[PDB]
Design a protein around this ligand. Structure first.
Ligand SMILES: Oc1ccc(C(=C2CCC[C@@H](c3ccccc3)C2)c2ccc(O)cc2)cc1
Ligand SMILES: Oc1ccc(C(=C2CCC[C@@H](c3ccccc3)C2)c2ccc(O)cc2)cc1
Lengths: 237, 10, 232, 9
């Protein structure tokens, strides 16, 4: 399947080259906030990111080998997790601030316009500060983000038995993360510890996603693009 | 034809 | 903190020794929405009492302030119940062993709104554990990790030291099992990724377990109710 | 809260 024949270095470069672009917001700073406008910007930003994420998912090793029903499920499961880890990643060098876009940098203060957002904001900030303390690398980040895509929805899927295929790709990415840490001059003890620390973060990105999702399908404050509605409704049942 | 399905199908 | 001073074997034995007992459900071998939740909420409330005292025996947990102990337990209690349920359901494929006298399949549990979905995810988790041949020494490490990790960034430096310690313990266990270096970090990763799904089950479970409609189906204990409200 | 009491004894 080629994805299994990939070396660690080949895995890294493939994930890096497949990275989506950073999109700009439709934010005019001369006109202050309404709950609707804020959600307007965020929903309008996420929906375009979704289009890129889908094409990004195609370039993730081993992802095309899956049936398209399985591809649909994995993305339906993980889309907010991936949006959030991306958000957290580009917000690393901006303490106390979330970099939704190069022109949209917000603190938790204006995170209070929307009800229930400040809770999610704080968690995103904590995660970002965690990535900052760990000196998380781009190569490590694209591995993690790739791990979220295939892992988040495996146990929510009749002799399919290519959940095994997903699992071996996951193992290969694990090998990749270890390879990277070995190159950074980390001892075996340090490698296993850092590996663990990184994967435990995923538990909290899952938590943030679910808490966020729960607030997202509560609405009517700004209407949602038909794709962002379908991704959202995939969780509402 | 979920929008997601079509976009993945292209 | 003494927990950091512990050896890998010392950590393992301390965790095994602190293991809560498998409780029984209220007997009478007679299932509606009220009856099912009745038995489940009764069992959960009794398990919580044992969990709290179990947590006090997790190396490093005592060193935290009373406030921080509360926070971690409030955050992780349903995760810990679930990984426990998944653990003891391992040798019963296709069934959840809530209690030795309460073993359920997926068909029973559509009595309850939203329970079937969570049920299937639990069975999937249990099937994953069994196919990985999860050991007891590994399970106690994972459950302790849940306790310390799940609420740690809702706050930590000390907790992260302990988390690293348990990671050292997990690796130590795998090296003793005869696993190669590659097989070690592969298995380590595979196990930790399950935590993400356990979090997911807890979150989706909580969403149903609070909400007024589910609160009203059967009177809940003050303790169980306070643990629920912590997520609301 | 009750959890406060149960953690001390
Ligand atoms: O790259 C992005 C990542 C996340 C978000 C976003 C977040 C991030 C922080 C705020 C979160 C929130 C918002 C309102 C209530 C509760 C939580 C959602 C969001 C907002 C609206 C949507 O329809 C979908 C995603 C956008 C881009
Ligand atoms: O060891 C246990 C593990 C889980 C449960 C339990 C589960 C069992 C699995 C399905 C869960 C559910 C129930 C209804 C709707 C959605 C999900 C509840 C439950 C029920 C009520 C509570 O207040 C707290 C925990 C008890 C003991």
């Amino acid at each position: 399947s080629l994805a299994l024949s990939l070396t660690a270095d080949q895995m890294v470069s493939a994930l890096l080259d497949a990275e989506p672009p950073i999109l700009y917001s439709e934010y005019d700073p001369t006109r202050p906030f309404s709950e609707a406008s804020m959600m307007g910007l965020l929903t309008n930003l996420a929906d375009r990111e979704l289009v890129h994420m889908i094409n990004w998912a195609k370039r993730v090793p081993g992802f095309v080998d899956l049936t398209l029903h399985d591809q649909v499920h994995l993305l339906e499961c993980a889309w907010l997790e991936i949006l959030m880890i991306g958000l957290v990643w580009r917000s690393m060098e901006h303490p106390g601030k979330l970099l939704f876009a190069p022109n949209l940098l917000l603190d938790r203060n204006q995170g209070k316009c929307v009800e229930g957002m400040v809770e999610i904001f704080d968690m995103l900030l904590a995660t970002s500060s965690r990535f900052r303390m760990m000196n998380l690398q781009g190569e490590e980040f694209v591995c993690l983000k790739s791990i979220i895509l295939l892992n988040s929805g495996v146990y929510t899927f009749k002799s399919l038995e290519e959940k095994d295929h997903i699992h071996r790709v996951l193992d290969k990415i694990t090998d990749t993360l270890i390879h990277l840490m070995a190159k950074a001059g980390l001892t075996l003890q340090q490698q296993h510890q850092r590996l663990a620390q990184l994967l435990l973060i995923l538990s909290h990105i899952r938590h943030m996603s679910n808490k966020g999702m729960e607030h997202l399908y509560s609405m009517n404050v700004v209407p949602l693009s038909d794709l962002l509605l379908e991704m959202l409704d995939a969780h509402r049942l | 034809h979920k929008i997601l399905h079509r976009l993945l199908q292209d």
